[PDB]
């Protein structure tokens, strides 16, 4: 996947 962040 491109252009996607991460939340924790």
């Amino acid at each position: 996947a491109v252009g996607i962040g991460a939340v924790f």
Epitope: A1, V2, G3, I4, G5, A6, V7, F8
Partner: antibody, heavy 128, light 108 residues
Amino acid sequence: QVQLQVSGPGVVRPSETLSLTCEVSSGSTSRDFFYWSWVRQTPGKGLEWIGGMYSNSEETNHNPSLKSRVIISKDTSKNEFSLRLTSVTAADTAVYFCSSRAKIYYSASYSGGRIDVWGPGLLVTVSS
Amino acid sequence: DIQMTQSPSSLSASIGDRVTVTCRASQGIDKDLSWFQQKPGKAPTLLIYTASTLQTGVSSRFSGSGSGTDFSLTINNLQPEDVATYFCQQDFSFPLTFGGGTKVDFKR
């Protein structure tokens, strides 16, 4: 303003600079980062991804059809994710959206999921 | 660039019908394909991601399949909230691109 709600002028004259802002927020942990995107919708061309950036960085990704007219920015001080479209023409009349994309790594028992949310759009018309 | 062709452009169906929209990428997009639902005045809402993963909160009446080049969205027990436009979104590479969209309309 709700999350990812777009604000700015609804009418721009041709050759002028469309400028929009988008309501964004920080994550709940200091490690959280989102991918913020400008997308637009027209009747004929449908949906078109204008460009985007990570909240982490200063780098921008673009659509090759628009890249040299697009300035994508952030101002955390005002909780703003901004688009500036220069050299605007009538072809740029559209509904403009913001989207936020992030993978979910909350836990060893909840992971791999994702958030991909769009806020309410704003109609911007280009005419004199 | 990578473009997604959706079929059919329009679809009319009855309550309870199983309906299918198809999308293909101009290249392999291995699994990086999402399905969105858009009601007329609203913003698109995520239904499926990674081509088959149902997003939390979306009814299991929506299902997704496919890989590589060919993908499908299926709505099984069609309900009044399903009248909308449905788009596929490729997130395999920049720029992100969308299918032309499919309207689901009610037979009468």
